[PDB]
Structure formats: structure tokens, C-alpha cells
Known about the structure:
- Chain A: The active site is at 41 (charge relay system), 89 (charge relay system), 185 (charge relay system).
- The complex is a heterodimer of chains A (235) and B (51).
- Chain A contains three helices and 13 strands; from the N terminus they run E-E-E-E-E-E-E-H-E-E-H-E-E-E-E-H.
- Chain A is mainly beta and 235 residues long.
Amino acid sequence: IVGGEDAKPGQFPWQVVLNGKVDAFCGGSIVNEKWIVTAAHCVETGVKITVVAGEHNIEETEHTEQKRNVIRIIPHHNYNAAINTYNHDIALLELDEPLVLNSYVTPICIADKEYTNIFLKFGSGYVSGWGRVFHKGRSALVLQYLRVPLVDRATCLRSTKFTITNNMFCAGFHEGGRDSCQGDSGGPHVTEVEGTSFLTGIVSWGEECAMKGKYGIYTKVSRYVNWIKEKTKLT
Amino acid sequence: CNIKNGRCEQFCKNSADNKVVCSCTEGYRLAENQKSCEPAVPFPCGRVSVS
Ligand SMILES: *C[C@@](*)(O)[C@H](CCCNC(N)=[NH2+])NC(=O)CNC(=O)[C@@H](N)CCC(=O)O
Ligand SMILES: [Ca+2]
């Protein structure tokens, strides 16, 4: 996250970090005690991955961390149907053992398709992660967060040569300086509705980070909430 | 549901006679005022409880 602030412990208790052949390589959010939602481009291939919930500072111990192994990865079935487009950039991870929910480990809410879009169109969401804090720079030790405005589709389309599909949205500032970035992929874009946060987007891609005239591109979660609910049922 | 979400804290559906029915997401119950959403489990989704 470029141009954000330090989170307080427990401020984003749905946020998790992913670790693998690279540490802190992506984020995710808690769907329920057994399931994380993240970006499909984070988990191409079946390399072994671990999830850490209740994480705050990734170089210190808070005694709130819960580490789990990933036993099943379900990228959306249309991800990579077309090469290099980031269309349908969303995936689910099943954990080996249930998370234990508490103040530091809490799911994000997920509304139906209609209300997820209504919440997105409120026009202001929070994004969070341990990704780069400068474009091509170092990663964060302390979880970062940033409020980003929704950007109108036409402006969105004009900002880039790359294709923005109806499964995506733009968010960020016209003057640049504040954005998500590499390492933040998979992290949740959330909309707060009278004290209760709902998942409205997933950090997916962009051109550099925080450049004036460019915006962060997010997976539009409203299009996928039916799929998330179908695949993450507990029994 | 037209204005202010029908006064529903979370979800609104139009019923009949221009009236509304509110509802809430998993982990919440419709409060008795039939608008607000109250926690129905120790750690409901989407809320900060460290503070
Ligand atoms: C995988 C995930 O961490 C990143 C998130 C980048 C978000 N960028 C902004 N400005 N909000 N996703 C990617 O790296 C996907 N590939 C791209 O974004 C490429 N266009 C740029 C790759 C690069 O600059 O390193
Ligand atoms: Ca830590």
C-alpha cells in the first residue's frame, strides 16, 4: 500500500497474509473458519502455501497469529480462459484446520449480488495489505490501510491501454500518490455499512503504483458472491 | 426501499402496500424494532471488537 497508514491491531481482523516460496507475497480475507478468498494470480500452480490470520507486524510476535496450511485451491473456473487479462482474478483457499474466531480473527461479511454492488457504489472503500509501500520498493512490516474512492467507468477505461472488463472496477485518486501495489494482491477492498464491513473488491492489478493518471484495478466481488457461497459451505 | 434503504440497517426488500421487510447477513438477527441488525454470535462478520 503506497501512501497509506499503519493499521491498529485488530482493525482489519478479516485480513490474512499468504506465505510460500516467497514470504508475505499476497493477502486474502477470511470467508469463514475454513476458507480464505484471494486473487487467482497469487496461487497459480499448486506450490505449497500457508495462511496467517491475526497478523499485524510480520517481523514480530503478537501472540494473536494463527498459522494454517492450504489443502485445496479453487481458482475461478474462467480465470486464465484468456491469457494475461486478469479477468476473473479470484480464488478460494481451504485451510487444513479451522481458524479459531476472536477479536483478531473475524470473517468479512459478504452480501448478495445486488447489495454488494450497492455497497460498492457508495463510492468509498478500504484496502489493506503488507505489499510495497513505494512502487518497486520495500514491503511493509506493519499492516497498511488506505481509503480509496471509486472511479467512474469512463475515466477508468481512458486511463489505460489494457482492457477493463465488467468483472473489474477502478479505484484511487486523480492526483496519484495513494494506491495498492505488488504484494497487496488478494487483499480485500471493503465497504463499511453502519459499522459492519462487507467485501466489495479484491486487489488485482495496475500499471506501476500510485502514478497520476492511473488507478488500481480490483476484481468486482458482486459478480462472484454466488460462487463464493457455493464453494465455501461448511457442514 | 427507495429512500434510506427503507430504514433497514442492512438489507431491504419491498413487500406490498408500500411496506418493507428488513433482513441481515449471517451472524446477525433482525432486532425487534424490525430494522436494526443485532449480533447473534460471539464474533459476527465485519466488525471490529478490539478497539
Ligand atoms: C499480484 C498482485 O500483488 C499485484 C497487485 C498490483 C496492484 N497494482 C496497483 N497499481 N493497484 N498484481 C500484479 O502484479 C498483476 N500484474 C500487474 O499489475 C502488471 N500490470 C504490473 C506488474 C508489475 O508492475 O510488477
Ligand atoms: Ca506478527
